[PDB]
């Protein structure tokens, strides 16, 4: 099994009240659903990603990332977000991320295609 | 089939000489392998991601993203990169991305965990 | 006077324990000193930047940014950080930022030149 | 004089056709004007920033950054951009940057306040 397979798998919540539901595979896979509390979004969207299944053993975090494309049966926001970050285990486990949200644009508006921000996920709230 | 399923699927090369091999599914999935020409990397790494399978029809690009965790049978760089960007079709097709590379760190060094940059992928070179 | 000239001018502290000392001019100027609690840094460094001296009047924040080059009489880290963010006034005033830290590199290592992160500044602590 | 004071001072142009006019001081200062070819902008805006006046002497670039707040006598876009990057000297001199553009927002829309991108400046075109 991945070192943090058990710690990462489950339901996570960020500071916006979004819900991240993920399964970590032994092989480094991340698979699940994302529900945003904000933006041009409703209900759940597919996600996929990857994590380091054999991290450093020195109080270092575990590197991971995932993608959501904002198309489901209800809406299409013609956009994708990627989260890149690290999982930190323990009584107050956290996933600390930075993200990039790209919208499809014309070539003329491509300079303004990409938002950046940061989300912190916890197992409570 | 996804609108750009045929256009995205295949082999892509970036400005560093890295090789991105991807299959786009009808359902929005991206699955393949990445080989970096730079950094703490050798040979191929698994990737997964998502794309907008029903983009805007107005000369807009197609939003997508993917993740690589830098662990394979040869090396573990305890890090993950996410690319967020858009596919632009046509005779000079391109995937224009920005990326976030997070390394696992101690809590003390977490301020310095994440590199940002930009890659442009073409079907030639 | 700038709308938030009085609110921005003074001493601010971030989550790392760094100290940001700034004077806001009527004309949109920011001038002061920065002392980092982390990294290849000691004592104070010059900063300069700009802010919106006539912001929206609808509970919107006030856009601003500033730069530090990490050279002073004690050390040279051959690097610069820019903070881009917004000032939010009131009893719990905050400056919410994202930053980009670029180091001088060779052309070969330029893909790895730039860190990204986020700092929140308060008037206490 | 700063090592690259002479190389940085002057008129630069990016891939969008924007014009960056800067004076580098011996002391690490950057002062000038910016004119954007895109966005909610017209004519010139004040900029200020900083550069490493004593860079590494090994074919390394010179770290720098600057800020524009998008208020002038003609328009106010309630936003600021910071560019963070490095100057590379020689026959094809370049300033390679990444930027963060923050708009003033309500607290509810603050997750969507900040665009990220990349500009390359040359002395021609």
Swiss-Prot record, chains A, B, C, D:
Positions that bind biotin: 34, 45, 83, 99, 111
Cellular component aspect of the GO annotation: extracellular region
Alphabetized UniProt keyword annotations: Biotin, Secreted, Signal
Localization terms from the record: Secreted
GO molecular function: biotin binding
Domain annotation Avidin-like: ranges: 5-125
Main subcellular location: secreted
Motif Cell attachment site in this chain: 50-52
Family: Belongs to the avidin/streptavidin family.
Function statement: The biological function of streptavidin is not known. Forms a strong non-covalent specific complex with biotin (one molecule of biotin per subunit of streptavidin).
Subunit text: Homotetramer.
Protein name (record): Streptavidin
Species name: Streptomyces avidinii
Section of the entire sequence shown: 38 to 158 of 183
């Amino acid at each position: 099994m991945g070192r943090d397979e058990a710690g990462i798998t489950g339901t996570w919540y960020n500071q916006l009240g979004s819900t991240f539901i993920v399964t970590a595979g032994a092989d480094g896979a991340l698979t699940g659903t994302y529900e945003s509390a904000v933006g041009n979004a409703e209900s759940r969207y597919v996600l996929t990603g990857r994590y380091d299944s054999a991290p450093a053993t020195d109080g270092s975090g575990t590197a991971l990332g995932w993608t959501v494309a904002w198309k489901n049966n209800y809406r299409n926001a013609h956009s994708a977000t990627t989260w890149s970050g690290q999982y930190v285990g323990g009584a107050q486990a956290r996933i600390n991320t930075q993200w990039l949200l790209t919208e499809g644009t014309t070539e003329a508006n491509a300079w303004a295609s990409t938002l950046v921000g940061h989300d912190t996920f916890t197992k409570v709230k």
